Every structure is written in structure tokens, then in C-alpha cells.
A paper describes a structure:
Upon ligand binding, bone morphogenetic protein (BMP) receptors form active tetrameric complexes, comprised of two type I and two type II receptors, which then transmit signals to SMAD proteins. Formation of this dimer is essential for ligand-induced receptor signaling and is targeted by mutations in BMPR2 in patients with pulmonary arterial hypertension (PAH).
In one ALK2KD mutant (ALK2KD-KK), two lysines within helix I (K492 and K493) were mutated to alanines; in another (ALK2KD-RRK), R490 in helix I, along with R485 and K497 on adjacent loops, were mutated to glutamates. Both ALK2KD mutants had greatly impaired ability to dimerize with wild-type BMPR2KD. In particular, ALK2KD-KK completely lost the ability to dimerize. The amphipathic helix I is almost completely composed of basic residues on one side, such as K492, K493, and R490, and together with the αH-αI linker lies at the center of the large basic patch within the ALK2 kinase C-lobe. The ALK2KD double mutant (ALK2-KK) displayed a dominant effect on the BMP4-induced transcription, almost completely eliminating the basal reporter activity. We also obtained crystal structures of the ALK2KD-KK in the presence of AMPPNP and the ALK2 kinase inhibitor, LDN-193189. Hence, the disruptive effect of these mutations on BMP4-induced ALK2/BMPR2 signaling underscores a functional role of the C-lobe-mediated ALK2/BMPR2 heterodimer in the formation of an active receptor complex.
Residue numbers in the entry: 208 to 227, 230 to 274, 276 to 496
Write the structure that this text describes.
């Protein structure tokens, strides 16, 4: 495989555009061996084939001067939803196309499929606009299963891995931050994905035009925490002071943003049990 154009760095590795046609090649720091392992575990055994999930190609360890860990996936030339939202504006058609496709990806991860072509129930745990890619057909796929937890109904076995990495601090649910999440109950990881999905929903809705105007792209809690907030930083905002992103008033002059602020509402309850499910979100968006 021919590494051609690097397209990013990160806190855990780097991503290249290579050929083998075009493929993406994430190259992990060996300080992040556990994420490469976990991701390679899920893709090679769960067989995750779905429109709204980053398709997988292969996984290997090679040369390069030294023993780098490669995860080779479908290349999407339009990149992250995060970079996409800072470049472009959305209308009604492209914005619903995007939040629905994310919702169906998260739902398909969250439900256990039984049968030959089945899968366990999977919770993402680091969902964010940088971990969603936009592909050249309107849909988006979810990526980075490095922290994924799995649950199999047949055994009631919860499988959380041994990755010491924690999710992106900005998108953490309050139960994660105050450290009262039930670690034994798989559903609480599903409710962590929903909280972050609500944040992503706010990110996307801002960039949808209505009555001729938009908001600039901003990351969640942009107005109250610094770039790269730390653990204690987000704790003050989400748990103690109980802050949520603000709804622009111009959403109440459009019926779509009306019912998009409807959803975010019901992913943001601090009590995680009250939060919507990805199936319910995906149902509502249809
Ligand atoms: N399959 C892919 N196709 C195209 N671009 C991709 C792909 N996977 C990742 N990227 C982009 O490559 C860049 C490198 O990012 P990456 O190292 O994967 O994580 P990140 O963007 O830094 N987010 P984070 O892991 O939270 O730090 C980002 O701009 C990604 O959007
Ligand atoms: Mg980067
Ligand atoms: Mg399977
Ligand atoms: Mg990533
Ligand atoms: Mg990514
Ligand atoms: Mg991935
Ligand atoms: Mg990873
Ligand atoms: Mg493991
Ligand atoms: Mg900020």
C-alpha cells in the first residue's frame, strides 16, 4: 500500500490517504496500541457492514524505520463532519440527511442483531463531529471504535476492554464527569453515546440556514470552556452549574430546527434514564 498524502495528526496517531484505489490509513502511536487492538477486534470479529459505519478493509503491523500499527478503512475525501461544518452551510434537505444518517449508525451499533449475520450490542463512547465522516453521497458514517464496549444478550457478558484512554473531555456526559456512571450496566454506555449525540446535533443544526441566516460553526460549550478543556474544567460546567448549549432564537422561526431542538432537549437530561434512545431518535427523524 502506497502512502501518498497525510491528512491529519491527532492525540493518538496520524491518518494518510494511500492507494492499494483510494483508502485511508490510520497509523497509531504505540502509546495507543490498545485502541488499534480494540478497533481491529471489533472490525475483524463483529463484521460491521452498514451504510452509516466507517467501512473496514484490513489491519496490520509493518516496517517504517518502527513497528507501526495500521488500520485501513474506506477513504472519504470530504473528511470529518467537523471540518465539513466549518466549510459549508446546510439547508433542510442536507441537514436532516446528515443527522438521520448519524442516528441510524448509532442505532445499528446499539441494538444486538441475532442470527448468522448478527452482531453484539456496541456502545461507541467517544462520539463527536471529528469521529463522523461525510461520504460522497450525502450520508455520514461513524468511525473510531477504539473505546467501544460490547454486550451479548446470550451470555449477559459486558465487555469493556482494557483501554485506559477516556473519551473526548468536551463531549463527556455528566455521569462520566462526576464518576457515578454504573460501570456494570451496559445501558449507561448507551446513554453516554446519546448525550454526545445531542451535542453533535447542536453542532449540525447551527449550520442550517433559515430565514436567510446561520450561526458560525462552534464546538459544544465554546463560550464557557477553553479549547482542549480538562477534566475539572468540564466538571464545573456540566455537573455543578448544569449548563447546556444555548438554542438560537432563529430556530423558532423554522419548523425543522423546532423539532431538532426537540431532540437535543431529550439527549441532555442530566438523569441518563430519561434520555431518548438511538432507535427513538432514528424513528423521530422519519
Ligand atoms: N477514513 C478517513 N477518510 C478520510 N479522512 C479521515 C478518515 N479517518 C480520519 N480522517 C481525518 O484524518 C484526520 C486525522 O484525525 P484523527 O487522527 O483520526 O483523529 P482526530 O481528527 O484528531 N480526532 P481525535 O481522535 O478526537 O483527536 C482528521 O481530520 C479526520 O477527520
Ligand atoms: Mg488532528
Ligand atoms: Mg458479528
Ligand atoms: Mg478519530
Ligand atoms: Mg476519525
Ligand atoms: Mg473507525
Ligand atoms: Mg481509535
Ligand atoms: Mg481487548
Ligand atoms: Mg472552547
Amino acid at each position: 500500500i502506497t502512502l501518498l498524502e497525510c491528512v491529519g495528526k491527532g492525540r493518538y496517531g496520524e491518518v494518510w490517504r494511500g492507494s492499494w484505489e483510494n483508502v485511508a490509513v490510520k497509523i497509531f502511536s504505540s502509546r495507543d496500541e490498545k485502541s488499534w487492538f480494540r478497533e481491529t477486534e471489533l472490525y475483524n470479529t463483529v463484521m460491521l457492514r452498514h451504510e452509516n459505519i466507517l467501512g473496514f478493509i484490513a489491519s496490520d503491523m509493518t516496517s517504517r524505520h518502527s513497528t507501526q500499527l495500521w488500520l485501513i478503512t474506506h477513504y472519504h475525501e470530504m473528511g470529518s463532519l467537523y471540518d465539513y461544518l466549518q466549510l459549508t452551510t446546510l439547508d433542510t434537505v442536507s441537514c436532516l440527511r446528515i443527522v438521520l444518517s448519524i442516528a441510524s449508525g448509532l442505532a445499528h451499533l446499539h441494538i444486538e442483531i441475532f442470527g448468522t449475520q448478527g452482531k453484539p450490542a456496541i456502545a461507541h463512547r467517544d462520539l463527536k463531529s471529528k469521529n463522523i465522516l461525510v461520504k460522497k453521497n450525502g450520508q455520514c458514517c461513524i468511525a473510531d471504535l477504539g473505546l467501544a464496549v460490547m454486550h451479548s444478550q446470550s451470555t449477559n457478558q459486558l465487555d469493556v476492554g482494557n483501554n485506559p484512554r477516556v473519551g473526548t473531555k468536551r463531549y463527556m456526559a455528566p455521569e462520566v464527569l462526576d464518576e457515578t456512571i454504573q460501570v456494570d450496566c451496559f445501558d449507561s454506555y448507551k446513554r453516554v453515546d446519546i448525550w454526545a449525540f445531542g451535542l453533535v446535533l447542536w453542532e449540525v443544526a447551527r449550520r442550517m440556514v433559515s430565514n436567510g441566516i446561520v450561526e458560525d460553526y462552534k464546538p459544544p460549550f465554546y463560550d464557557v470552556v477553553p479549547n482542549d478543556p480538562s477534566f475539572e474544567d468540564m466538571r464545573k460546567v456540566v455537573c455543578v452549574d448544569q449548563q447546556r448549549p444555548n438554542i438560537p432564537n432563529r430556530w423558532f422561526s423554522d419548523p425543522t430546527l423546532t423539532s431538532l431542538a426537540k431532540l437535543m432537549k431529550e439527549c441532555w437530561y442530566q438523569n441518563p434514564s430519561a434520555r431518548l434512545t438511538a432507535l427513538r431518535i432514528a424513528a423521530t427523524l422519519t
